[PDB]
Amino acid sequence: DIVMTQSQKFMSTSVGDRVSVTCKASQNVGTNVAWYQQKPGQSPKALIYSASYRYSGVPDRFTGSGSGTDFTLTISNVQSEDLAEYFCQQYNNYPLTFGAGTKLELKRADAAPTVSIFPPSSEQLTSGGASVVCFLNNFYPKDINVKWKIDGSERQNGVLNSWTDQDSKDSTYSMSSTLTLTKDEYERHNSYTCEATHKTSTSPIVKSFNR
Amino acid sequence: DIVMTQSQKFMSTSVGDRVSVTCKASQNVGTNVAWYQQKPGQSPKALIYSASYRYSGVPDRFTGSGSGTDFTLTISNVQSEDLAEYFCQQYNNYPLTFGAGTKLELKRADAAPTVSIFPPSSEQLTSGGASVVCFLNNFYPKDINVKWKIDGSERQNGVLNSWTDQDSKDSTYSMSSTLTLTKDEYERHNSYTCEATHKTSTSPIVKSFNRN
Amino acid sequence: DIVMTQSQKFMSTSVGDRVSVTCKASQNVGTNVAWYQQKPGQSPKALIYSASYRYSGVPDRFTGSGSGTDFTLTISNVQSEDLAEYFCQQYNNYPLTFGAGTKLELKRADAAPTVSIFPPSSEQLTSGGASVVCFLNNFYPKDINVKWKIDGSERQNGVLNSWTDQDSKDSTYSMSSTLTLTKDEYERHNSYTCEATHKTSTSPIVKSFNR
Amino acid sequence: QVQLQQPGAELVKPGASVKVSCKASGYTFTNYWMYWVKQRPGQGLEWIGRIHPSDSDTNYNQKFKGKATLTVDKSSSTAYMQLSSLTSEDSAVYYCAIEIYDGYNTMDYWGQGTSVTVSSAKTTPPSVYPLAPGNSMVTLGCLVKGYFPEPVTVTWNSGSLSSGVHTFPAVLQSDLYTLSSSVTVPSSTWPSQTVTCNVAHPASSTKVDKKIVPR
Amino acid sequence: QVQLQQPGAELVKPGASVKVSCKASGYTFTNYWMYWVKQRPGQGLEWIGRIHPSDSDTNYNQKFKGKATLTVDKSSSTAYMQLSSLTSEDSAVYYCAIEIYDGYNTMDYWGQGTSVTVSSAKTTPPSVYPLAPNSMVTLGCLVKGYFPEPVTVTWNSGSLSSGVHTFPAVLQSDLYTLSSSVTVPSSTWPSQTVTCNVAHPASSTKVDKKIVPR
Secondary structure (H helix, E strand, O other): OOOEOOOOOEEEEEOOOOEEEEEEEOOOOOOOEEEEEEOOOOOOEEEEEOOOEEOOOOOOOEEEEEEOOEEEEEEOOOOHHHOOEEEEEEOOOOOOEEOOOEEEEEEOOOEOOEEEEEOOOHHHHOOOEEEEEEEEEEEEOOOOEEEEEEOOEEEOOOEEEEEOOOOOOOOOEEEEEEEEEEHHHHHOOOEEEEEEEOOOOOOOEEEEEEO | OOOEEEOOOEEEEOOOOOEEEEEEEOOOOOOOEEEEEEOOOOOOEEEEEOOOEEOOOOOOOEEEEEEOOEEEEEEOOOOHHHOOEEEEEEOOOOOOEEEOOEEEEEOOOOEOOEEEEEOOOHHHHOOOEEEEEEEEEEEEOOOOEEEEEEOOEEOOOOEEEEEOOOOOOOOOEEEEEEEEEEHHHHHOOOEEEEEEEOOOOOOOEEEEEEOO | OOOEEOOOOEEEEOOOOOEEEEEEEOOOOOOOEEEEEEOOOOOOEEEEEOOOEEOOOOOOOEEEEEOOOEEEEEEOOOOHHHOOEEEEEEOOOOOOEEOOOEEEEEOOOOEOOEEEEEOOOHHHHOOOEEEEEEEEEEEEOOOEEEEEEEOOEEEOOOEEEEEOOOOOOOOOEEEEEEEEEEHHHHHHOOEEEEEEEEOOOOOOEEEEEEO | OOEEEOOOEEEEOOOOOEEEEEEEEOOOHHHOOEEEEEEOOOOOEEEEEEEEOOOOEEEEOHHHOOOEEEEEEOOOOEEEEEEOOOOHHHOEEEEEEEEEEOOOOEEEEEOOOEEEEEOOOOOEOOEEEEEOOOOOEEEEEEEEEEEEOOOOEEEEOOOOEOOOEEEOOOEEEOOEEEEEEEEEEEOOOOOOOOOEEEEEEHHHOEEEEEEOOOO | OOEEEOOOEEEEOOOOOEEEEEEEEOOOHHHOOEEEEEEOOOOOOEEEEEEEOOOOEEEEOHHHOOOEEEEEEOOOOEEEEEEOOOOHHHOEEEEEEEEEEOOOOEEEEEOOOEEEEEOOOOOEOOEEEEEOOOOEEEEEEEEEEEEOOOOEEEEHHHOOOOOEEEOOOEEEOOEEEEEEEEEEEOOOOOOOOOEEEEEEHHHOEEEEEEOOOO
16 A cells, blocks of 8 residues: 655644644655545544645644655644644545554643642542642653652552643643542551652652541 | 253252253254263263263262163262253264253251451552452352442442352352452441351351451 | 364355455365365265366365365355355265355345335135135345235234245345145135334335235 | 544443444535544543544454444444454543544544443442542542442533643543542632532443532 | 373463464373364363374364364374364363273273463463361362462372362452362361472463472
């Protein structure tokens, strides 16, 4: 089949600036090239058809160029709402083939996380389980270390970590960390500490509670 | 496909007497019929070939007869060692087909069960679980009812019951009942009782222990 | 004995196309391999001997290849009259052994059944019995459902169905459904109905008669 | 309005088959090609095939030859893609989509996508737990624990509360999925007003509204 | 001596394939038909097919026509039954068997049978627990939470056989559990060591658990 390359897996820029994506086709696909946008959790959205023509509702900021084998998608005046994965696709020959996809990244200043800790709810305790949840919201860059302490001893098991994609409002990152214990194990200890280590400070951000 | 229909799912006699199991073939198979004995947990054992001829090592107490469609396997001087499921088979037509199987049963006098209770081992308590085991050995008939009581309250969940087949020595039955709790639940209560209701007594047999 | 395994039990193709059936021997039989064709209700007809030589009268559309273990019969320009079962046989070692056989199936467009109902004849009514017959002819694919109603109530007992093999002229299927009752039972009711349900059916095909 | 309605999730045992539906409405069904796209988790887009509901003409991708079969039902204006002999590699989101050029503008319309999960596990509905605190703003949360299969939809106050919301991607652990969601609101909003976490799990027909109650 | 050796258990995921082996020894491999039999848990016996290792001549049951494939390897005197596209229906014990008539007597020889379990769950070795408490005393052994079948239980390496009750395994929440009791004279325990020997071939597990008075 015809192969659409897209050499870059990630593209970076700042809010208000511009970015571009190349797409290399293994053979001549004329101008029968389309560009799609996919935000996380949503269906793909067609941006460009026929190499350079926009679909209805696609703003001027998205411009497609190229013919033959070298096609480029250019996004100007980039805003945080443009955070998505972008695919090229040829429809000049069958079967229809897509590019690997290029995800947009937005550079910005560092930001320390706002950390919040939540004890197990009374409802969960009736189920025999006990989850302690620690939210780490709106930090940058995405790299962050989180540790759990139970009465001074570290626990690195039964922890479920999940990171959001880059925030569509302020380009920051957020992280949820869940320490799950049995109700008996939970009631056999007092202090439950959540420690966040981020490059914004050498001192960890500490949130704790005594049950 | 020829169907081999064994009339009875179970055949009953006393120790020393004789039983017989019949097998009906849908079409004529002449004498190309075999019989097999399968004890619990073992591979089948061929007893009869050509409807009436015995394999080497099969005692003469096992006698096969019949030709055409009606075949019979007779076991004389039945002993507790003969407790098994017995199958007929035809090798006259392809595909070879077996009978559904007839399980031998033995009548005997009633027998009250010997009941033994066991608290959770210290080994299991380190794993967070706690199983209380109740053994009910060597009773007859097989019908029995077991209840678990925790400080007087009946627990009919988290219970695992298992029945043995009829004993190959005294033709009795045995039961194992295991109540599994978490270690927290186990330490939240004191009295653990295994209650057995059997035909041999209008009053239930009660084995208990206090964790105290 | 030598095993001649025909991997495919069926072989689907369309009229005019070319089909190939394979036959693998458990041991080396050289070229001492024959192919046979058996149409329904007929004696087998020898097609190929010496793995590749045709019997007199066999059209050149039937070709055979292979030496040693792997053998293949190929039918070019497949006709609707070619619907049959095809066997491979080795005669290099005794006893001679046949393959399990491969049935030729023909593909075609869908076709609705032509349904005809017939009341019990006056000759059969003098015998004490009564058989109602419904023909469902020249339909495709072969899956079809028939429901018998007596005075609007579904009847299941006493129904015997029979399906023909694929028609040697148009590659369709046919089925006959016969409801047999006693003459007294047949005269206890009035309306008799056979309902045909098929892939082509947007609604059942209902044919009825009133005694 | 032009719409393409697709079911949320389909849980099918390995080796079995499934039929994914795409109900069209608001336009002439038989006037536009219907495209089908497959997207495995964390992967890219793959073209399955297309079909024209007028005459059921199809263009297939050879990769999905014996795997996918496209059909249409013009009486219901519904397109179907049947997947057969299901394996783990078939677990993905399946989109139906059309492209309309009305002589003035070119618009694309997509279905929501059907999350087909191939597994021997059975459905498990989620256990929704409130996250209430033990400043000018307050952060509340919602723990959606132990469900299968994907997906679940989480909204706050039936979507009326959208700013300051972070819904975290689901993590698979011990054959079960779990996610969480946080919302930050003015301190004058909670606990004075009602804050409700709305969880929807279509694979189990579950809709749970859990209010974030102060203690 | 004539022997037919089969592996104890095979755990195969739904849709995959498994090949059960039957290693023969003590006789001329190519002289006798090799039969195969399927027995679902708690069901009857079903004939799969037979193969003669001399020339690999086979006779299949139509029900297992595409499912089972019988082969032999004469360099190892091993028979093989391959099952394809496994489903829950194919979970059973599979025996290989031969019949020998030497001109004097007719004997049958059977393998132990391979417990093929078709499931997406992983292997779990059992947790073996001692059951410790007149003229007799009853001891026990709890073999809890294992997968898949089977497990074998002996007492004192088989030297302690009379007075033993080994209860069939029960599946409960994806795991098997069985127990075994032994009744001995009050002078045997706790004076002498009483050992419960558990083997779980699916996980290569052999655990010896002493019934310690404690």
